[model samples]
Each structure stands twice: as structure tokens, then as C-alpha cells.
Target: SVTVHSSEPEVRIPENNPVKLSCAYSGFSSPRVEWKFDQGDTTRLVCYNNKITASYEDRVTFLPTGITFKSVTREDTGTYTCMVSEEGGNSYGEVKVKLIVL
Candidate 1:
């Protein structure tokens, strides 16, 4: 039984400031973590296999339970989903965070 929890359901930050989105989890032996972003009809991958995607490599870094942004812009406002799964297992969990950049 995998479980995920977010530090914040919604977060607001000023433009061009560092921000950390947290997703805490438990009950897995080998964990695989990723983050996904969505805004309206647009969707993007922020992290894959616990690594920041190339498109986001310039400003993002991955963590075991979350991710950090060196700086964020208004364009970054969206819904961020932290997804976790067990490697070679069926256990899975996820949490969502809404970000607002001002």
C-alpha cells in the first residue's frame, strides 16, 4: 500500500523566486517518482524517473519526494501532480499541487 501526501494543496509565489513543491510518501521498497504539469489544454512533463526533463532542466531539479524550481515565472502557474510508483511492482500513489506565480 503506497501513500502520498503533499505539503501544500495550493501555493502562491512571486515571479522569479525559488520554490519547492513537496510530496511525501511511504510504503514502497523501490520508488519511482515523477512530476507532471497541466494547464487547460496544455500539459507537460516536469520530471521523469526522478530526473528533471530536458525542457525543464534549466530551471528545475528533482528530489526523492518532490522538486525545486530555481526560479519560476507566471507561465509556470498550473496544476502539478506528483506521481509515485514502485519499480517492478503494482503499488502506486499520487498527490496534486496547484501553483500560482504572481
Candidate 2:
């Protein structure tokens, strides 16, 4: 059996404020993560372990457990998906983040 736990669901900022989405999972070895953005159009991307898509290069911080946006923007208002894995490379758990920039 596997397990999943999380506490962060969403975040809102008043005018380009920075924020972080927290997530973590324990119970396995060789854990890894993948991320995605759903801004009406969702695209799964590699944004962990210091590797990320070019658009986020130097613009955000990401780890297997969480993500940070230095300054949220209107264009940054969206759902950030964090999927953590450990089950024989076939199973995973996820955390959803809705970033609203006010």
C-alpha cells in the first residue's frame, strides 16, 4: 500500500505578491516529481530537481516537495500541479495549487 497527504490547496496574492505551494510525501525510496500548469490548458512539465522548462528559468523555485513564485502575475494565475511518485514507477500522488494574483 501507498499513502498521500497534503494541506495546501490554493493561494491568493494582492498584486503580484510572491507565494509558495507546499507538498510532501513519505513512504518510499527513489521518489521523484513532475509538475504541470492548468491555465485553461494544462501541460505536464519537468520542473523538479533543479530542472525546469525554459519559461520558468530563474523565475521560480521548485523541488520535489514544493514550488515558489517570486512574484505572481496575471499570467501566473493558474493551477500548478505537483505529482509525486514512488510506486514502481507506475503510481503517484498529486497536489493542486490555484494561484490567484489580485
Candidate 3:
């Protein structure tokens, strides 16, 4: 089984504040990792392949360790999923991160 690790399971940020999302994969080389928003259109924010369609590519950054989102808004509050692809056309591992905006 594949493993998925994230920086935080839950994050709290004030309205109009900056928030960063960190995701990492332990298995597979250059795995397809994606950061998806669970609410209000269900769009992908960042992707490892850099081919996935995203709503806001400017606000998203793909890093060596993970990904980051700058200046998050109230609408950004939701459950984010980190998906990683594995072997045999079978992509595994996911982490649900809850973002709370006050």
C-alpha cells in the first residue's frame, strides 16, 4: 500500500489571510499529486504533472517538498484532498485537510 503524508490535517486562518497547503508522497517516482478543492465548483488548485486543469494556477505553487497557496480567502475554506498516483494504473493515497476561516 502507498502512503500519503501532509503537513497538517486541519488549518485555521482568518479571512483574507495567507494559508499554505503542504503535501508529500513517500512512494512512487514523480507521482501525480494534486490538490483539489471540495467546494464551490470542485476545482483543482495544484498538480504534479502540471497538465491538470486548475482554477487558479497563479495562486498555486509546486515545490520540491509539496505545494503552497498564498493569501487564502474565505471561499477557500473547505476540505482539500491530496491525491497521489501509484503503480499499475492504480493511483492511491489521499489526505483530507480542513481549512477553517474566521
Which candidate comes out best when scored by TM-score?
Answer: 1
For residues 1-102, could you state the per-residue lDDT of candidate 2 as single tens digits?
Answer: 455555667787876687777766776576776678888865656386446778886767876557777776777778887777874776677778777888
Using lDDT as the measure, the top candidate is: 1
lDDT of 3 at 77: 79
TM-score of predicted structure 2: 0.81
TM-score of each: 0.95, 0.81, 0.78
Q: lDDT of each prediction vs. the true structure?
A: 0.90, 0.71, 0.71
Error of 1 at 15 (Å): 1.0
Model 3 lDDT per residue over 1-102, tens place: 567888788899888766776776676755666667787667645564534345666676666356666678777778888777764546578888888888
Model 2 local distance difference test score: 0.71
Which model is ahead, 1 or 2, in terms of lDDT? Answer: 1
| Model 1, span 9-56: residue lDDT tens | 899999999999998999989899989999988989999887888899
Which parts of model 2 are misplaced by more than 4 Å? Answer: 42-50
lDDT, residue 42, candidate 2: 56
Model 1's number of clashes is 0
